[PDB]
Amino acid sequence: TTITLYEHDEKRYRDIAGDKKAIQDALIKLNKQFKKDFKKLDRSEDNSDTEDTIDESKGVVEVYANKIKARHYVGFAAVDNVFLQILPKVFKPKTWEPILAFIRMLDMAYGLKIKDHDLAYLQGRNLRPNLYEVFIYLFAKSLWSEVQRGYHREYVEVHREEKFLRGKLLMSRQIRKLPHQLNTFSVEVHELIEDNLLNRIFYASVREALRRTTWGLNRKLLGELMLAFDGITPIHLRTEHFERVHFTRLNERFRRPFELAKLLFMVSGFFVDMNKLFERFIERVLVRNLAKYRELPSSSTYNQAYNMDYVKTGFKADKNFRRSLNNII
């Protein structure tokens, strides 16, 4: 059951065509999982203090016996056949325009490099509006564009007993061989291997993505990524795995799929507070045109003190702020 919510919207269980309890206790195991991961989640005067506040069904959503009221935490959530997404109510209309505004919000504020032509490709594909399947697509398209541009291979120094002399003959190991051991060479080789730790992360991210994706567009994109990572060893994606990748000239072109693979993989789903999503927004806005999130710098749209207009639903919004910058400066 896919739940599409804005912040502080309430839809009852009778409103969503699903089950009366399977929609409940799925995300109950997520907002308690959000209570477990609450200390690493960043807040900027959001006034939560959830040491025991989120334990009383007050995590990313309110689990009432009648309805589900959403909170300021925006993002997607996939648990136990129940998909949930919470969007900013700034972008709430009077069906794809609110989601891509939320993509381009955390593209230019959270520091990602989400291309606009990849978001323009999803429009007109008559798909269902889904935060998870958009980020599954953006990970899988950026990974498939990179693997097509070149398969990631690393050089590793291997000391092998080889039946053909490849690379550098290890002389002190070959000299100290008894004469019944002279049917192989002790060599040092620097070989282009494909089973890297970066490719093992990308393989286990494509495996976890087909386990939960529902678009045929993403499934076809991830299936050809699955055949690309065929000879790669399957791993389990720990947080220990994602820190052993260090980005140099060899693999910095695989950084855009990696920051998307880290955003999805590490009950799972990304959530940022919209209070601090607006904090990191305007500090990247005030510095190139030259923070309370309630209705009453604040946000201004067709549904919603310097007001910030939103033409980002589909860069001339900051030109209207010059009339506000003429008084502020």
Binding site: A22, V147, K220
Partner: protein
């Protein structure tokens, strides 16, 4: 035999243009069979070794087994020695050049040295150290003669030689084709307009591909991603798509293939079984044609065209239990492999998407997990249940 003499014609015309072709397509389309039958037709030799060779690339296959490498050999007193053994491409490229230098009626080719080099290239036991040094000496004479020989005679090397590289995408082709990225191109061969003689690292010897050597590769395009080939290496080969041909799976076309190699008293005994098989399929002579076309279009929509099911599995089907074998051991494991056990996608390919717990190929388990997970299980249907489920795919 009208359709075999045009797939021969695609291979024959493009081998004259590019020097080397790749037959690509899904597994089971007859790519290894077309490549082998073209070469036994062109080179009138049923066995590899003289004017053609058969090699299969695998993940562990290397440049050193293909071109040359330092290799531990033994003496005639079986003491170990490290020599540079020529690989299978270099042994047949030198064979194609030296046999091509036989028929050249030139007054500068030392035919006694060239025929002795041919014997050491066609010797199949490993060379004695007293004839390995003769083999290095005659190769040293060969590239001395070839380098001072004009393109008018080097481009007309008459006996064509062939190298079938089966499963060529299963190896790291750029690593295995070390100098062969440059050398295989038709301009870069001997007698070519931009003829290139390379120096090989291990032996230190000159090397070039002769023009009468041809390489037919076969690529199963569902066993390795075709978007992982090198674009520059792709420029060397003509790429011939060998697609599944379910028109071979009609009753008259099944008879026209299986009666080219067996006797007449076995022919109509095979024909009465094919008439017995197709009678149980609703007396539809185009049943296996329609069954393979319907699942391959359904595969092409939700997967690649490269992951289609080939026609060669159903080609030796003459009973219902032969069709029951091919479906449950060549089709259904192959569909589960291609779709990574996505039961909802396979059941749409098998035209049974909103249909479980019945006469289906994938029954749903009645138990659900704690996370709401549903599992599907392959159901073996026999008799009228199997034929009625194959008719559900067509309908």
């Amino acid at each position: 035999g009208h359709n075999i003499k045009e797939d021969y014609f695609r291979v024959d015309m493009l081998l004259n243009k590019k020097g080397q072709v790749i037959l690509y397509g899904p597994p089971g389309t007859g790519k290894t069979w077309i490549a082998r039958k073209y070469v036994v037709e062109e080179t009138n030799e049923k066995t590899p070794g003289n004017k053609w060779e058969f090699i299969t690339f695998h993940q562990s296959y290397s440049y050193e087994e293909f071109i040359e490498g330092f290799r531990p050999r033994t003496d005639n007193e079986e003491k170990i020695r490290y020599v540079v053994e020529d690989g299978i491409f270099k042994k047949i490229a030198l064979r194609a050049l030296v046999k091509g230098l036989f028929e050249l009626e030139d007054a500068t080719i030392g035919k006694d040295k060239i025929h002795r080099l041919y014997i050491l290239l066609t010797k199949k036991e490993p060379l004695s150290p007293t004839e390995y040094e003769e083999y290095l000496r005659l190769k040293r004479y060969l590239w001395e003669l070839v380098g001072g020989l004009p393109k008018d005679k080097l481009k007309n090397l008459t006996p064509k030689f062939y190298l079938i590289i089966d499963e060529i995408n299963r190896g790291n082709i750029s690593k295995i084709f070390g100098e062969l990225i440059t050398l295989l191109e038709k301009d870069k061969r001997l007698g070519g307009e931009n003829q290139l003689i390379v120096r090989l690292p291990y032996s230190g010897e000159p090397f070039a591909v002769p023009p009468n050597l041809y390489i037919i590769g076969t690529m199963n395009t569902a066993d390795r991603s075709i978007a992982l080939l090198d674009v520059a290496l792709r420029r060397r080969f003509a790429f011939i798509e060998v697609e599944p041909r379910p028109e071979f799976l009609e009753k008259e076309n099944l008879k026209k293939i299986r009666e080219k190699k067996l006797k007449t008293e076995d022919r109509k005994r095979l024909n009465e079984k094919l008439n017995e098989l197709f009678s149980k399929l609703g007396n539809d002579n185009y049943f296996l044609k329609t069954l393979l076309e319907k699942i391959n279009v359904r595969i092409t929509v939700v997967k690649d065209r490269d992951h289609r099911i080939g026609h060669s599995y159903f080609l030796n089907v003459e009973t219902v239990e032969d069709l029951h074998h091919v479906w449950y051991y060549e089709v259904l494991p192959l569909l589960m492999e291609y779709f990574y056990n996505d039961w909802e996608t396979i059941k749409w390919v098998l035209n049974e998407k909103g249909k479980e717990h019945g006469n289906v190929f994938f029954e749903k388990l009645r138990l659900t997990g704690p996370n709401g997970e549903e599992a599907y299980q392959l159901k073996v249907l026999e008799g009228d249940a199997f034929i009625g489920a194959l008719k559900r795919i067509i309908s």
